[PDB]
Design a protein around this ligand. Structure first.
Ligand SMILES: CO[C@]1(C(=O)O)C[C@H](O)[C@@H](NC(C)=O)[C@H]([C@H](O)[C@H](O)CNC(=O)c2ccccc2)O1
Length: 118
């Protein structure tokens, strides 16, 4: 019962900040010996730019640096994403991924679509 659940659609005004509520889950029998890495991707099937990367921010795309931050407690299985200072180009799909081990990792196939308005 691996899974990720975040809203299908979210809306925000340009210049404003927007939060994407998110929670996830995985089997109680999976050992977690090195924490959980959290990663949010923008337009995964297109440009696939990294929005947030808890294991190493250097992987974060330059256009999202300083404008996106993770408001999630990995221990409580919360992956809320906060996007600050919204821009028209931020419109698109965001998909969350968490990694516990080489084989125990997961990418949400659904994802959340953001729409930025004037
Ligand atoms: C693609 O390979 C992996 C992965 O995400 O690294 C291997 C990983 O072991 C596996 N995790 C588990 C617990 O089975 C993982 C997982 O099957 C996928 O991330 C699930 N998501 C999707 O199937 C998917 C497919 C298309 C688009 C987006 C997501 O695939």
């Amino acid at each position: 019962t691996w899974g990720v659940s975040s809203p299908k659609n979210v809306q925000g005004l340009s210049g404003s900040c927007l939060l994407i509520p998110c929670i996830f889950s995985y089997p109680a029998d999976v050992p977690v010996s090195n924490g959980i890495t959290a990663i949010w991707y923008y337009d995964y099937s297109g440009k696939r730019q990294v929005v947030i990367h808890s294991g190493d921010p250097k992987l974060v795309d330059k256009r999202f640096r300083g404008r996106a931050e993770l408001m999630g407690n990995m221990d409580h299985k919360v992956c809320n994403l906060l996007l600050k200072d919204l821009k028209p180009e931020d419109s698109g799909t965001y998909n969350f991924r968490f990694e516990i081990s080489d084989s125990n990792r997961w990418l949400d196939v659904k994802g959340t679509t953001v729409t930025v308005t004037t």
